[PDB]
Design a protein around this ligand. Structure first.
Ligand SMILES: O=c1cc(O)n([C@@H]2O[C@H](COP(=O)(O)O)[C@@H](O)[C@H]2O)c(=O)[nH]1
Ligand SMILES: O=c1cc(O)n([C@@H]2O[C@H](COP(=O)(O)O)[C@@H](O)[C@H]2O)c(=O)[nH]1
Lengths: 218, 220
């Protein structure tokens, strides 16, 4: 996956007009948008097609899929019917649940990203202790795309070690949550950035600023 | 107190076709006043499906969204879900206490309810979830969670969950029917059972629901 400027916009504004306007403002800097439940549940799944129509961007559906296999299959099918290129799935519910997602992705020509570890303080309670084993499970299952946390670069580095250099790794928690763009890109292929851009006084300047700070990594 | 679930039976409406979902739900309306709507139907037909179910049927709505994000995003998901008219939302506990608290805070502000999913009914649950389950449940109790979801397919584990949360907590349980769980055995511990495919794929969903209810008649 070739992500422009190694920068994925997390578009979590819940108003359609604002989401479209802000994305338009930063479109010269990105070609990949992560769309999650805040926007989808507020404005409907048709928003995905609208983004492709306006911007021609790739769309990663950040749905943190975390159900039983039967239900995971249906969620993936509905998501890809809406035009998402990829979907993010939790590993914590186990291998069968991940495989259900991999199957639908293969059938529809899409990708699964496995979330092995999260960026927020609560991740320490249960997720961190399982993370390495979840990553190894990804490797065993043939997963090639992963998500890990900007807010713990030592843990992000370990994730990169487990999955190898061939795997693709994207990383949220940059900016608002404290992660540094450049340090994160030592290990991740691309950074995910939400509020630092879309809540900035000037989103275009914020995006340009982040890119300037990593210019030697592009 | 607790939501008064008719016949201790919650329909899991996971048909993705709007017409079929409406037809089947209408057919079992006399048996069930509480419907669980998840992402298969919502992602296929929109959040307005909650609006349509409320209009068409006299049913409470539990949004089974297994909320599993960071606190910031969890708050937004809960807000959007309650805005659409869901009475309650189901949340994962494995992302930790801050993520659960975010959901509780929104539910409190908005006059709605959170259900905490402490462990799951499928084989994959054995890998990571089961080891964390007792602590996730204890965390729920510590946070003031009153409503819980636990698996009918693991009776010993469902029993332990009931012990941890106490008799006053409200517990609902999926995995009955298609996944092999028994209605009566499950209601030893759960307040209500969740049933999907064995009702909505039946030639006669009303007869299927009636049959389940007949099998648990003395528990009502
Ligand atoms: O561990 C994770 C996994 C995520 O997907 N995310 C997501 O990445 C985005 C981060 O946005 P922000 O840059 O505003 O903090 C949000 O959409 C959030 O749901 C995260 O923050 N941490
Ligand atoms: O551990 C769990 C938690 C669930 O919410 N569920 C949900 O309960 C329902 C089970 O439906 P069914 O009776 O067709 O197996 C599905 O909506 C599923 O997503 C489950 O099966 N196991």
């Amino acid at each position: 996956m070739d992500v422009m400027n190694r920068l994925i916009l997390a578009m979590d504004l819940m108003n359609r007009d604002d989401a479209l306007r802000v994305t338009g403002e930063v479109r010269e800097y990105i070609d990949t948008v992560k769309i999650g439940y805040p926007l989808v549940l507020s404005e409907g799944m048709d928003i995905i097609a609208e983004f492709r129509k306006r911007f021609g961007c790739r769309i990663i559906a950040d749905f943190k899929v975390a159900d039983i296999p039967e239900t995971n299959e249906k969620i993936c099918r509905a998501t890809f019917k809406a035009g998402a290129d990829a979907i993010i799935v939790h590993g914590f519910p186990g291998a069968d649940s991940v495989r259900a997602c991999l199957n639908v992705a293969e059938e529809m020509g899409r990708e699964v990203f496995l979330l092995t570890e999260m960026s927020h303080p609560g991740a320490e309670m249960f997720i961190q202790g399982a993370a390495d084993e979840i990553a190894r499970m990804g490797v065993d299952l043939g997963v090639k795309n992963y998500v890990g946390p900007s807010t713990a670069p030592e843990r992000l580095s370990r994730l990169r070690e487990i999955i190898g250099q061939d795997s693709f790794l994207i990383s949220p928690g940059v900016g608002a949550q404290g992660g540094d763009p450049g340090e994160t890109l030592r290990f991740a292929d691309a950074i995910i950035v939400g509020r630092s851009i879309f809540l900035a006084d000037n989103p275009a300047a914020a995006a340009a600023g982040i890119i300037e700070s990593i210019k030697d990594l592009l």
